C-alpha cells in the first residue's frame, strides 16, 4: 500500500525539531566541550557544522524525500551496491537506541529524587557519601582531597560507581526500574498508541527551550561565570594538535544531527515530493547548533561558578565524562529560588528532550526495518510484536550499562557504538556515494525536480570534497595518533573493553563492505558487469 506522508508541512518540522534537538545538545556537547578544553572544541565543531553536518543533514533528508523509503531501502535507488550504508545506519541507531535511553533512566532517577523538599545533591550528610565530602559553600573556609556533594550523589548514589569495567558490581534495581519505566513510556508512545499530536505542538516544542533559557539566565548571573565563559570560548590552539578534539567535535555534529542513523532519511521519506526541505532543514540546523551553543553557555557559566565556589580550576571541577549535565545543572538548580520546583522542571525537560529524540530514532529504525520487509511486518498484529521485541532487546542490552559498573560501559558505547569513527565511516560513504557513484550533478538534478532549485557550490562541494576530506582526515588522524579511551581522565580502559568498543564501532562500520561482498557474490558475471549492475539505481 501507500506508506504514509506528512499531513502538514509542520509535521516534518516538529518531527525533526524534537528529533535532533535532544541530549546531544544539552548533555553531550557540554562534556565533549569540557573534556577537550572548552574553547578548542568549538573550532572543529563549527568546521564540521558548516562543512559536514548541515550538508549531510540536507543530504539524508533529500535521500528520504526523493527515494520515498527509509534508511535501508532508500539506497535501492541510490546505488544499491552501497545499500549496506543503510544497514550500517541501523546498527548505529540500534546501539544509540540502547545507550541514549540509559541517560533518561538517570534523569528519571533524578526526577524521583527531586520531589524531596531538600535536594539530595544539595547537601552531604547521607549514607552514600564519603567522609571527605564538604559543602561547596564551605570549601573556602577550611584547609585538595575534598569532594562536592553533587559529584558524590552522582557517583555513589545514581551511578554507584565501581572500580572499573572489570567489576560491574550488582545490577541497580533503582536504575533498572527507571530504565524499564522509560521504555514503557517509549513503547507506549511509538505506534502502540497512534501519534502524539495535540500536546507536541506547544509544550514539547517550547518548554525545553524555555527551561534552557531559565538555566542560561541562572548561569550567566552566577558569580565567577565569566571565567567559565572564558573557558568555554577562548581556545587552546595546541589542543587542536590532538585528534581527540577533531573526532569528538565531528562525531558530536554527526550525533547531534542524528545523521548516520537512518532516521532523518526516514522522516524525509514521509515528506511530500515537491516540498522545500532546504529552508526548513537550515532553520532547524540553526536551531540545533544554537541550542547546543546556548546550553553550553549556560553549563559552562555554571561550571565557572563551581570553580569560583570550590577554588579548584575549571577543567577539574566536575566530571570530564557523561555526567557533566548531571553535576553542573543540578548544582545550578540548587542555586535557584525554590530549588525543588526547578529540579522537577529541569529533569522533566531532560526527559522530554530524550523521549522526543528517542521516539524519533526508534521511528527511524522501525520505518527502515519495515520498509526493508513490507507485508512481513504489516500495520497490525506484527508491528506490535516487533516493537515489543525491539524495545525488550534494547532494554535488556541497556541493563549491561545501568549496573554499578555501568558508566564504563556507557562511556564505551558513547565513544564507540554510535558516536565515533563509525559515524565518520557512514557519513564519508554517504557523501562519497552521492558525490561520485551517483553524482552531485545527477543528485542536484533530482533535488531541483522537487525542491525547485540547484543546491549551491557549498552543498555540492561539501558532499563532493569537504565532508569526505573531513571524515577521512579525522578517521586517519584518530588512528595515526591513537590515544585510548579514558573515562573521567583517570580510568584507563583495559584492552578487552577497548576491543569491545571497537567491536561496536566495527559492527557499525562493517555493514558496508559485508553488503558489498554479499551483493558482489549474488550477481552473475564478471566484476565490471556486477559492479555496473549494482551501481545503477533501481
Amino acid at each position: 500500500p501507500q506508506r504514509e506522508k506528512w499531513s502538514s508541512k509542520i509535521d516534518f518540522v516538529l518531527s525533526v525539531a524534537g528529533g535532533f534537538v535532544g541530549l546531544g545538545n544539552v548533555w553531550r556537547f557540554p562534556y565533549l566541550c569540557y573534556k577537550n578544553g572548552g574553547g578548542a572544541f568549538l573550532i572543529p565543531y563549527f568546521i564540521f557544522l558548516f562543512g559536514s553536518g548541515l550538508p549531510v543533514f540536507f543530504l539524508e533528508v533529500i535521500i528520504g524525500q526523493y527515494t520515498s523509503e527509509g534508511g535501508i531501502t532508500c539506497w535501492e535507488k541510490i546505488c544499491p551496491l552501497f545499500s549496506g550504508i543503510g544497514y550500517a545506519s541501523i546498527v548505529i541507531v540500534s546501539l544509540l537506541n540502547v545507550y541514549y535511553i540509559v541517560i533518561l533512566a538517570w534523569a528519571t532517577y533524578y526526577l524521583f529524587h527531586s520531589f524531596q523538599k531538600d535536594l539530595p545533591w544539595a547537601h552531604c550528610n547521607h549514607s552514600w557519601n564519603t567522609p571527605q565530602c564538604m559543602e561547596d559553600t564551605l570549601r573556602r573556609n577550611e584547609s585538595a582531597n575534598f569532594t562536592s556533594p553533587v559529584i558524590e550523589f552522582w557517583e555513589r548514589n545514581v551511578l554507584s560507581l565501581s572500580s572499573g569495567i572489570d567489576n560491574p558490581g550488582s545490577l541497580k534495581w533503582d536504575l533498572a526500574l527507571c530504565l524499564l519505566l522509560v521504555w514503557l513510556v517509549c513503547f507506549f508512545c511509538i505506534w502502540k498508541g497512534v501519534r502524539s499530536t495535540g500536546k507536541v505542538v506547544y509544550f514539547t516544542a517550547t518548554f525545553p527551550f524555555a527551561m534552557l533559557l531559565v538555566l542560561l539566565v541562572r548561569g550567566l548571573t552566577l558569580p565567577g561565570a565569566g571565567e567559565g565563559i572564558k573557558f568555554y570560548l577562548y581556545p587552546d590552539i595546541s589542543r587542536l594538535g590532538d585528534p581527540q578534539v577533531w573526532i569528538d567535535a565531528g562525531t558530536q555534529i554527526f550525533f547531534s544531527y542524528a545523521i548516520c542513523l537512518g532516521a532523518m532519511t526516514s522522516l524525509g521519506s514521509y515528506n511530500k515530493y515537491k516540498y522545500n526541505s532546504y529552508r526548513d532543514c537550515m532553520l532547524l540546523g540553526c536551531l540545533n547548533s544554537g541550542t547546543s551553543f546556548v546550553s553550553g553557555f549556560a553549563i559552562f557559566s555554571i561550571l565557572g561558578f563551581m570553580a569560583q565556589e570550590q577554588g579548584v580550576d575549571i577543567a577539574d571541577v566536575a566530571e570530564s565524562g557523561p555526567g557533566l549535565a548531571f553535576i553542573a545543572y543540578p548544582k545550578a538548580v540548587t542555586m535557584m529560588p525554590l530549588p525543588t520546583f526547578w529540579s522537577i522542571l529541569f529533569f522533566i525537560m531532560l526527559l522530554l528532550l530524550g523521549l522526543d529524540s528517542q521516539f524519533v530514532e526508534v521511528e527511524g529504525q522501525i520505518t527502515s526495518l519495515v520498509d526493508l520487509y513490507p507485508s512481513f511486518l504489516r500495520k497490525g498484529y506484527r508491528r506490535e510484536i516487533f516493537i515489543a521485541i525491539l524495545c525488550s532487546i534494547s532494554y535488556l542490552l541497556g541493563l549491561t550499562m545501568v549496573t554499578e559498573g555501568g558508566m564504563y560501559v556507557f562511556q564505551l558505547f558513547d565513544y564507540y557504538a554510535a558516536s565515533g569513527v563509525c559515524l565518520l565511516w557512514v557519513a564519508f560513504f554517504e557523501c562519497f556515494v552521492i558525490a561520485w557513484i551517483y553524482g552531485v550533478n545527477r543528485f542536484s538534478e533530482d533535488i531541483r525536480d522537487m525542491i525547485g532549485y540547484r543546491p549551491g557550490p557549498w552543498m555540492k562541494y561539501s558532499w563532493a570534497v569537504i565532508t569526505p576530506a573531513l571524515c577521512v582526515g579525522c578517521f586517519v588522524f584518530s588512528l595515526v595518533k591513537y590515544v585510548p579511551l579514558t573515562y573521567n581522565k583517570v580510568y584507563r580502559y583495559p584492552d578487552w573493553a577497548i576491543g569491545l568498543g571497537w567491536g561496536l564501532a566495527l559492527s557499525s562500520m562493517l555493514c558496508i563492505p559485508l553488503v558489498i561482498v554479499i551483493l558482489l557474490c549474488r550477481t552473475e558475471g564478471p566484476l565490471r558487469v556486477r559492479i555496473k549492475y549494482l551501481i545503477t539505481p533501481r
Partner: antibody, heavy 118, light 108 residues
Framework: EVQLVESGGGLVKPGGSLKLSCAAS????????MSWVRQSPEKRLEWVAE????????YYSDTVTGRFTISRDNARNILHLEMSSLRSEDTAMYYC????????????WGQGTTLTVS | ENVLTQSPAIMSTSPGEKVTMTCRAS???????LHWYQQKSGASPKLWIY???NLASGVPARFSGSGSGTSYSLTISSVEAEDAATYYC?????????FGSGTKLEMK
C-alpha cells in the same frame, strides 16, 4: 551574457513534423533546466515542454503530451524540440526559456521561431 | 491544468498614474513560484517579478508585487512610457506550467 538563439521554424503541413533548435551560449548549459514556451497568434503564452538539467525529468503540457519531444545536447549546447503530427492549433512563436530555479522563473528567454501550420 | 485567469487585457492608463493588475489561480500557487513577465510589442517576454514580490535584473523599483495562494497582483506606482507592454502571471510549481492571459497596458 546569456544568449539563446532559436532556429528551425518554418511552414509545415498539418500532421507534419519539425525539429527546433535552441542554441545556448554564455552559461554552463548542463546545469540549467530548459523549457519551450510557445505564444499563440492571439499573443497568449502557453508553456509547451520542460527538460531538466541532465535530461532525465521531462515534462509536457496536456496539449503536447504525446506528440512533442524535447531533448538536450549538453556537449554542444543545443536544446531541441522535435515535433510530430503538428495540428492546426500549434502555429505559434516558439521561445526557449531558461528556467532552472523554480522560484526565479524563466530569467532568460530567447528569440522566436514562427511555426506555421497550413 | 492550473488555469491562471488574469485581469482583462486591454487597460488604459495615463502616464504617471498608479495601476494594478490581478491574477487568480484555479489551484493554489505556493507564492514563491508565481512570477510576472513583461513582453513588449514585437519582442520576447522577460522576467519582471519572481516569487511574486522580488524584482528581476533591470526592473525599476516602481514595480511591485503582492498576493498569496490564489490572488496575486502587480502594481506600478508611476507609469512611464516604457511600461507599454503585456504582463503575464505564471505559476511555475505544478508541472503542467501555465501562464496567465494578457494584460496590455496601453496609454491615453
Amino acid at each position: 551574457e546569456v544568449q539563446l538563439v532559436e532556429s528551425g521554424g518554418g511552414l509545415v503541413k498539418p500532421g507534419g513534423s519539425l525539429k527546433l533548435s535552441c542554441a545556448a551560449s554564455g552559461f554552463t548549459f548542463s546545469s540549467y533546466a530548459m523549457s519551450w514556451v510557445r505564444q499563440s497568434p492571439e499573443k497568449r503564452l502557453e508553456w509547451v515542454a520542460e527538460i531538466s538539467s541532465g535530461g532525465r525529468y521531462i515534462y509536457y503540457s496536456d496539449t503536447v503530451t504525446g506528440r512533442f519531444t524535447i531533448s538536450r545536447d549538453n556537449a554542444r549546447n543545443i536544446l531541441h524540440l522535435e515535433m510530430s503530427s503538428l495540428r492546426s492549433e500549434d502555429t505559434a512563436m516558439y521561445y526557449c526559456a531558461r528556467g532552472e530555479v523554480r522560484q526565479r522563473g524563466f530569467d532568460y528567454w530567447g528569440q522566436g521561431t514562427t511555426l506555421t501550420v497550413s | 491544468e492550473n488555469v491562471l485567469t488574469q485581469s482583462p487585457a486591454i487597460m488604459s492608463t495615463s502616464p504617471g498614474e498608479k495601476v494594478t493588475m490581478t491574477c487568480r489561480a484555479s489551484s493554489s500557487v505556493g507564492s514563491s513560484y508565481l512570477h510576472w513577465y513583461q513582453q513588449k510589442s514585437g519582442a520576447s517576454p522577460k522576467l519582471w517579478i519572481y516569487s511574486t514580490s522580488n524584482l528581476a535584473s533591470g526592473v525599476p523599483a516602481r514595480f511591485s508585487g503582492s498576493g498569496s495562494g490564489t490572488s496575486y497582483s502587480l502594481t506600478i506606482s508611476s507609469v512611464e512610457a516604457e511600461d507599454a507592454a503585456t504582463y503575464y502571471c505564471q505559476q511555475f510549481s505544478g508541472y503542467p506550467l501555465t501562464f496567465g492571459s494578457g494584460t496590455k497596458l496601453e496609454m491615453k
